[PDB]
Design an enzyme around this catalytic site. Structure first.
Site, short mmCIF file in Angstrom:
data_model
loop_
_atom_site.label_atom_id
_atom_site.label_comp_id
_atom_site.label_asym_id
_atom_site.label_seq_id
_atom_site.Cartn_x
_atom_site.Cartn_y
_atom_site.Cartn_z
N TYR A 1 -2.56 11.43 0.78
CA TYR A 1 -3.22 12.72 0.66
C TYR A 1 -3.85 12.73 -0.73
CZ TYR A 1 0.40 13.91 4.16
OH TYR A 1 1.23 13.96 5.26
N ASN B 1 1.85 8.14 7.89
CA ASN B 1 1.71 9.24 6.96
C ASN B 1 0.70 8.72 5.97
OD1 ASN B 1 3.85 10.81 4.43
ND2 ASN B 1 1.82 11.32 5.21
N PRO B 2 -0.58 9.06 6.18
CA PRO B 2 -1.67 8.62 5.31
C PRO B 2 -1.61 9.27 3.95
CG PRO B 2 -2.43 10.39 6.62
CD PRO B 2 -1.06 10.04 7.16
N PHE C 1 7.76 19.28 3.43
CA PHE C 1 7.93 18.24 2.42
C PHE C 1 8.70 18.81 1.24
CE2 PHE C 1 3.85 17.03 4.47
CZ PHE C 1 4.28 15.83 5.02
N1 LIG Z 1 -5.97 2.51 0.87
C1 LIG Z 1 -4.74 2.20 1.22
N2 LIG Z 1 -4.52 1.22 2.11
C2 LIG Z 1 -3.28 0.91 2.45
N3 LIG Z 1 -2.15 1.45 2.03
C3 LIG Z 1 -2.39 2.43 1.15
C4 LIG Z 1 -3.62 2.85 0.71
N4 LIG Z 1 -3.48 3.82 -0.28
C5 LIG Z 1 -2.20 3.92 -0.38
N5 LIG Z 1 -1.46 3.12 0.43
C6 LIG Z 1 0.00 2.94 0.49
O1 LIG Z 1 0.62 3.94 1.31
C7 LIG Z 1 1.92 4.24 0.76
C8 LIG Z 1 2.13 5.74 0.65
C9 LIG Z 1 1.69 6.68 1.78
N6 LIG Z 1 2.10 6.15 3.12
C10 LIG Z 1 2.35 8.03 1.50
C11 LIG Z 1 1.68 9.22 2.15
C12 LIG Z 1 2.07 10.56 1.52
N7 LIG Z 1 1.77 11.65 2.44
C13 LIG Z 1 1.32 10.77 0.20
O2 LIG Z 1 0.54 11.74 0.11
O3 LIG Z 1 1.53 9.98 -0.74
C14 LIG Z 1 2.01 3.59 -0.61
O4 LIG Z 1 2.95 2.50 -0.56
C15 LIG Z 1 0.63 3.06 -0.88
O5 LIG Z 1 0.69 1.79 -1.53
#
Ligand SMILES: Nc1ncnc2c1ncn2[C@@H]1O[C@H](C[C@@H](N)CC[C@H](N)C(=O)O)[C@@H](O)[C@H]1O
Length: 383
Positions: A88, A85-86, A166
């Site tokens: 957003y 879940n990247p 969500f």
């Molecule tokens: N550039 C990045 N590289 C690696 N992890 C990241 C990056 N940006 C954020 N995160 C991590 O990803 C996690 C959150 C995401 N997986 C959540 C996705 C959710 N759909 C959102 O919009 O927030 C957090 O613990 C961040 O620290």
């Protein structure tokens, strides 16, 4: 947001990796997908998790945790499966330039989820699979055009509509399953039940090459076939914004005789314009509105973009100055009956057409959605 259990369960059921394969979870934090996959497909895999915050990275001993920026990370290996879940969103901004430089699908302000998708498809080995839960915006927005081309060019794409699943609403989600081998696009619908989500194949596009993605049907296609695109009869112009108005020597912050209100979306109603009520706090002599946008001097068609995925049209018979919305000016040689047009655009059949096609991908009607709305034969035509 987070990632609801059932959604996670859904994504892991679409996930597949050869025994011994490398499984990766970008922006993993505590590894929700890594754990779920293991608990579902077994332990005979090489697990990896990439997280950027030391305070969030919390993985079990069986998984290799890596503290880095996925976008800047450059491993010396390719993966078999990538789940996640990247982030957003947008945005020491040397990093922003770094992203632009490294990411070819980057267009406009873009969005991080788009960057995660490109990066992920690149760390994929031939035949590799990627499963991500992202916003539906990339289906129709212009900023995601290069991305759609990228995916179409790189492999087979399956899009599963989930919708607003969500905690926070107004964010329609879609699950994308990508395999780095082959070509095509399959659009799937889903049915939510006490048991979770059930996939329902909607339609397949074997020759997909990046084109906007819509939920088409027989009715949708007939309507578009038996009619001309609005974009063929009109010039779609945009209104000037507040600063411009606030910069015009003739614009006043208080009313007065001879002063006309600067209209906004709250003045536009289905079929009519409320010229009275002021919602901008700006007033100006109607005659001088032409000095901001030429078309302000001409009575024309106004379609809203501030009212969601809904078509709200009205004819500005008086030609008042506007602070927003879509402004349609007829093309040379196009003769039309304004009253019938408006009625047509605001009709129940038009609403259903737009809603069937674009659902809630975006919170508003876009130019692209607008310009291809079908106008019936006997209203407007080319001479
Ligand atoms: N550039 C990045 N590289 C690696 N992890 C990241 C990056 N940006 C954020 N995160 C991590 O990803 C996690 C959150 C995401 N997986 C959540 C996705 C959710 N759909 C959102 O919009 O927030 C957090 O613990 C961040 O620290």
């Amino acid at each position: 947001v987070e990632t609801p259990p059932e959604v996670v369960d859904f994504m892991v059921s679409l996930a597949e990796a050869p025994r011994g394969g490398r499984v990766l979870e970008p922006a993993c934090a505590h590894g929700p997908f890594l754990r779920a996959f293991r608990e579902a497909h077994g332990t005979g895999y090489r697990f990896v998790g990439v997280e950027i915050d030391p305070k969030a990275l919390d993985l079990p001993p069986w998984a290799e945790g890596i503290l880095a920026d996925f976008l800047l990370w450059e491993p010396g290996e390719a993966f078999d499966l990538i789940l996640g879940n990247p982030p957003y969103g947008i945005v020491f901004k040397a990093v922003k330039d770094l992203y632009k430089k490294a990411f070819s699908t980057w267009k406009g302000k873009y969005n991080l989820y788009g960057a995660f998708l490109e990066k992920a498809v690149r760390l994929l080995k031939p035949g590799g699979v990627l499963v991500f839960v992202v916003p539906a915006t990339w289906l129709v927005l212009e900023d995601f055009a290069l991305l759609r081309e990228f995916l179409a060019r790189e492999g087979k794409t399956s899009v599963y509509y989930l919708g607003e699943v969500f905690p926070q609403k107004k964010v329609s989600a879609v699950v994308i399953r990508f395999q780095k081998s082959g070509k095509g696009l399959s659009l799937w619908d889903t049915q939510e039940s006490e048991s979770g989500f059930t996939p329902i194949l909607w339609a397949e596009y074997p020759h997909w090459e990046g084109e906007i993605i819509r939920f088409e049907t027989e009715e949708t296609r007939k309507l578009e076939i038996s009619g001309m695109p609005l974009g063929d009869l009109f010039h779609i112009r945009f209104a000037a914004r507040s600063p411009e108005f606030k910069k015009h020597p003739a614009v006043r912050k208080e009313p007065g005789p001879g002063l006309v209100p600067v209209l906004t979306g709250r003045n536009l109603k289905p079929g009519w314009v409320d010229y009275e009520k002021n919602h901008s706090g700006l007033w100006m002599p109607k005659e001088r509105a032409k000095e901001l946008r030429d078309f302000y001097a001409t009575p024309h068609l106004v379609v809203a973009h501030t009212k969601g995925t809904r078509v709200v049209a009205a004819w500005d018979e008086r030609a008042y100055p506007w602070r927003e919305e879509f402004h349609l000016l007829p093309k040379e040689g196009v003769r039309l009956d304004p009253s019938s047009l408006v009625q047509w655009l605001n009709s129940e059949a038009m609403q259903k057409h737009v809603r069937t096609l674009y659902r809630d991908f975006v919170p508003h009607l876009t130019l692209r959605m607008l310009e291809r709305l079908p106008v019936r034969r006997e209203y407007g035509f080319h001479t």
